[PDB]
């Protein structure tokens, strides 16, 4: 074994970029496995951090001078490092990838429900909300759901992505008080690692099992609700869970959050109609009110707990 103070001196990269690389391979001190760091020093990602540092000296001499014309040139002729060749070393078999995608969506579904700060870039956030609704696009399409669990923390989910019971906590749609303690440098690098990981899987679930990746979006449905009813999808049963709500057209109402709840019914198969969409054939209306008002005979009035009772 070697020392934590040794490896940074050994690698001669940034300590943060040591910590940034160390997330990428998945190396943990048992102390630092000395062959593994010797295994690390010949890796193409290590090429880029030296180059990304030497980009930064070459750019600040640019703007420091005042030739912004030359400064602007540096960006357009600047690569990005990919994390494809951190993946295939780490995820040999695709079914091993889906047993680590547990933590992946457990991060990435958090990040969609985040305000953009100085600390976090919104492009990451607007990808995260995009990737979530890309995730839910496939899940709601081919009905791949098994179990649900709404709790205090968030809303757990359970689905057999080729049989592995993934579990991904969607938090509740509220402002979230960002604590001063946390670090969005380490967490983002996980997201950075997880984001590209989530691309190939969604490519895999589409282009090998289902559809084309990624499908186009529908903008005008995204103007209304910005969720799962938008982002339309085109290609080119055994469980009773998948047979639930089969031609059972629902109305949802303004009490519940539709976004957490339109997902399940579309994961089952029933149609979802909201109050919120403007801003009959339905036969259910979910309400959380001590004072209900309309009460037609065609609609069946059930509090949404029972819908979660229908799943478990």
């Amino acid at each position: 074994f070697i020392t934590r103070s040794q490896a940074v001196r050994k690698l001669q990269v940034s300590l943060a970029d040591f910590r940034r690389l160390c997330i990428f391979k998945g190396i943990y001190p048992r102390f630092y496995y000395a062959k593994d760091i010797q295994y690390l020093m010949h890796e193409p990602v290590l090429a880029k951090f030296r180059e990304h540092k030497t980009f930064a000296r070459k750019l600040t001499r640019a703007l420091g001078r005042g030739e912004v014309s030359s400064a602007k040139r540096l960006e357009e002729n600047r690569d990005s490092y990919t994390l494809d060749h951190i993946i295939k070393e780490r995820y040999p078999s695709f079914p091993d990838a889906i047993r680590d995608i547990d933590d992946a969506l457990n991060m990435l579904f958090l990040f969609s429900n985040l305000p953009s700060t100085n600390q976090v870039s919104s492009k990451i956030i607007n990808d995260a909300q995009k990737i979530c609704n890309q995730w839910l696009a496939y899940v709601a399409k081919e009905r791949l759901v098994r179990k649900v669990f709404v709790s205090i923390k968030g809303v757990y989910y359970q689905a057999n992505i080729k049989g592995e019971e993934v579990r991904w906590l969607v938090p509740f749609k509220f402002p979230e008080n960002i604590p001063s303690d946390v670090d969005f440098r380490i967490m983002l690098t996980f997201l950075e690692f997880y984001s590209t990981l989530l691309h190939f899987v969604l490519y895999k679930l589409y282009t090998d099992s289902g559809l084309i990746y990624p499908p186009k979006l529908d903008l005008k449905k995204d103007k209304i609700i910005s969720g799962l009813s938008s982002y339309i999808l085109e290609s080119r049963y055994d469980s009773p869970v998948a047979s639930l709500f089969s031609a059972f057209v629902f109305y949802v109402s303004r009490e519940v959050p539709i976004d957490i709840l339109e997902f399940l019914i579309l994961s089952c198969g029933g149609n979802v109609i909201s109050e919120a969409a403007m801003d009959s054939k339905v036969t259910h209306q979910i309400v959380d009110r001590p004072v209900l008002k309309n009460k037609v005979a065609g609609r069946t009035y059930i509090q949404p707990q029972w819908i979660f009772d229908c799943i478990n």
């Binding site: 190396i27 547990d102 509220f174 380490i186």
Partner: protein
């Protein structure tokens, strides 16, 4: 003349096609660089996967509500020397579910399991 000679040479090279004009290079970069992460790539530590909760929720059997003394005793105790990361509450309605204030930290502590362990 100098610049006029130099252009004529760059005319000559595109006459021979050694050089692409800059407008088509954007078109070389328009077809490229959107097609990113869009290819097949497939065709030992067990990572300590998290414990699956079932039936401990927003609307539980209410004996799972903590005793009022252990409420403060959970608060007076500090973190990680600690059994629950919360205290469960009771909600009859779906609407009354609060802002789950500590979900950011729950991943940040989980994240430290992922590489430091």
């Amino acid at each position: 003349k100098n610049e006029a000679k130099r252009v004529m040479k760059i005319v000559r090279a595109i006459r021979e096609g050694r050089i692409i004009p800059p407008k088509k290079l954007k078109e070389m970069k328009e077809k490229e660089k959107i097609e990113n992460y869009q290819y097949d790539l497939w065709g030992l530590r067990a990572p300590k996967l998290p414990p699956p909760t079932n039936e401990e929720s927003y609307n539980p059997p209410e004996e799972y509500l903590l005793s009022p003394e252990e409420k403060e005793a959970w608060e007076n105790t500090e973190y990680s020397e600690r059994e629950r990361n919360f205290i469960p509450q009771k909600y009859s309605a779906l609407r009354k579910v609060p802002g789950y204030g500590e979900s950011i930290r729950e991943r940040f502590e989980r994240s430290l399991d992922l590489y430091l362990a």
